[PDB]
Amino acid sequence: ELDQLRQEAEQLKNQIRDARKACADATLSQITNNIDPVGRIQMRTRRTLRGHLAKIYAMHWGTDSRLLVSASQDGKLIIWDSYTTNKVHAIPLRSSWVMTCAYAPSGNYVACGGLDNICSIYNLKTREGNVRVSRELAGHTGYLSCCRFLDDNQIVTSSGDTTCALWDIETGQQTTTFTGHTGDVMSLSLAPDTRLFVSGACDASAKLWDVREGMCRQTFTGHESDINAICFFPNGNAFATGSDDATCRLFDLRADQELMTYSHDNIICGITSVSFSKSGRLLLAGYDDFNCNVWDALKADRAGVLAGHDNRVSCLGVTDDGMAVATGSWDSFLKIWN
Amino acid sequence: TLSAEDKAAVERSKMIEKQLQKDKQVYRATHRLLLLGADNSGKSTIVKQMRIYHVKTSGIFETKFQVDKVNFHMFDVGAQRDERRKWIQCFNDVTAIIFVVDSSDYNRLQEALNDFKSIWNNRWLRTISVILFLNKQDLLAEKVLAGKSKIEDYFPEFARYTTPEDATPEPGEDPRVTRAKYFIRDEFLRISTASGDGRHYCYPHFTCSVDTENARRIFNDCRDIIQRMHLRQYELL
């Protein structure tokens, strides 16, 4: 009967929990309590980027570490030259309620999406001077919340319909649909080798997916509330999550557990963006108290604070050469820190 | 100082900034609104009539209307899921929220009250006023006149309720429909006045699906809301 199936599922869950409990021999803090502390680190706002009309929800560094795409609720995508604070392109969108953007690794395309349930793709390098819509990918039921390019012809979208999809851009059809979540998916981080990707949803859980096979490999259930941000450690064997319970957590795919938790009694607002540095030593996280924080990823103590915004920090991104940090906020200002 | 190509790049950036200022001029002068409601509530009829007088899994629809040379945006969400707690943050700074409720469907009215309560107490919707369209009043007219479907059974406090002195039944109609509709209004208003804290208000209206005087109501309420915020920032209160 259905009760028998429920009992079998409960037994399997208990078995997984027991195996995880057996596999955990020592905490990360015990191993790391011998390494020297990172020390107080101070970053100063080298540049400020003015021009966005409304609040900023998205931002993604270019692979060249100099260009920068940004998304705001007014309906614009602005491509910045980070070194000179110039504006390269100003892309007006068909729907103003955008909540994610991405910059292609090649540099030829950008993508954006939001409450329109569509992940539009824009062609930056055309024979004509203007930037045009290459394709509009439709098929998601809820709002698109994050998109990351795999290459010029493949993109991965997470939506608020408990589903992530893998699109083929040339023919706008879903090669694979990743189901298994029960709440709205928010964040999405691709592995450096682009063979797996993690996703965090409102079910207070995260799943590691297989892009090729299309099947969930592991499910992680640390947080006590909906997960807002996720990102891979540069190794590819770890990731960190930021949720609404004012806690960051670090998981490991191989150990299939949670290694360390980043929380402070005097911070009680949820995290909105999480990113790592090049070495993985620093875990930069945005917060709702208008101030980004810098965590030592091996010790769980705040190395520094980035307070320069008059509203909550929504987006965060560390450049590929590890040289700077961009921080967008609901005050419509981007700041480059170094 | 800097090279010729960099000068041309700075010039292009300056032209982009000029276009952005032109866009800002029209952004600050357009008042954005969020339309909410249930499937039975005639918000589709409201938006269709507003558009007329003035796409498969699409998730948002936009409607321009203009009253006395003032621009208005109206957004309603089409393909979203049942959960609302996540995409409601994007409307933290709209001018007002238009909540439309069916007053002729006493079976689903408690769910509408709970939804209005969740909107009114959302942590991101503080200082956002709500325009309440108590809709489909004509249907409520028959529902109350003909006694086939009663109302005291769904709500066991209609008996101990009296029509308030402020009531103004204008056209000429039976006192029973006035009493019932003001009872529904006062349910929504007790939810509104429980925990307002003075930072936002609820403007109720007795509308029908096909009424011409809806954009005027939204215009008046938005006038009041902008006036209140201007009193706040210009240090009068």
Partner: single-chain antibody, 228 residues
């Protein structure tokens, strides 16, 4: 994209003429336009430049007060008003499309050219060679002043004018292959001395190779190397 232009012919000395350049197939309003001329048997010489938005205009010191460049963005047209035409102002004038942002490729499209005949302290580029079917050929050019800026950009451009038609961009900023140029062409330099290297030459690569500096106005070209 295409840039068709007209308005040339025989003009008596001391007269005047207006050249027009009709653009179609690209967003004209976001491109800065140049006028480039070459004498009937001589090399290219830069004439004028109008910026996007008409905010910046430059002229050659040889036409500074007589010529006037102008554009009509809603009509997608480019003008060159010439007055006091001497016998040294005979050439065939080109319409060049240029855009400037981080990573753009200026001087990437050239018009067909219109011909005009008149009846009877800057950087200098020297291409010392003047002439040179499956073999590697290396061209070279030199400059008086270093073209390397403090940005790290070497503003050197390479153009190919096949025997019957207009110049075609091959390398911009000394090392970047233009869109559509085969990977056979490569460019290199050191700040003052430069070179272009065709790897496996084919019969469509014969013509005259021109160099350019975009470091500072006026832009200077160089005589050009012939391949036969």
């Amino acid at each position: 994209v295409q840039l068709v232009e007209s308005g040339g012919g025989l003009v008596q000395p001391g007269g005047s003429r207006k050249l027009s350049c009709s653009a179609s197939g690209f967003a004209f309003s976001s491109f800065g336009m140049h006028w480039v001329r070459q004498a009937p048997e001589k090399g290219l010489e830069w004439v004028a430049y109008i910026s996007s938005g008409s905010g910046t205009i430059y002229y050659a010191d040889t036409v500074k007060g007589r010529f006037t460049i102008s554009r009509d963005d809603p009509k997608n047209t480019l003008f060159l008003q010439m007055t006091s035409l001497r016998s040294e102002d005979t050439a065939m004038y080109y319409c060049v499309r240029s855009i400037y942002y981080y990573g753009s490729s200026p001087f990437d499209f050239w018009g067909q050219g219109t011909t005009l005949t008149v009846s009877a302290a800057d950087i200098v580029m020297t291409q010392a060679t003047s002439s040179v079917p499956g073999e590697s050929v290396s061209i070279s050019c030199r400059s008086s002043k270093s073209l390397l800026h403090s940005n790290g950009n070497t503003y050197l451009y390479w153009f190919l004018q096949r025997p019957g038609q207009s110049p075609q961009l091959l390398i911009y900023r000394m090392s970047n292959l233009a869109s559509g140029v085969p990977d056979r062409f490569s460019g290199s330099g050191s700040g003052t001395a430069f070179t272009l290297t065709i790897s496996r030459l084919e019969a469509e690569d014969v013509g005259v190779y021109y160099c350019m500096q975009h470091l500072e106005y006026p832009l200077t070209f160089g005589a050009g190397t012939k391949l036969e």
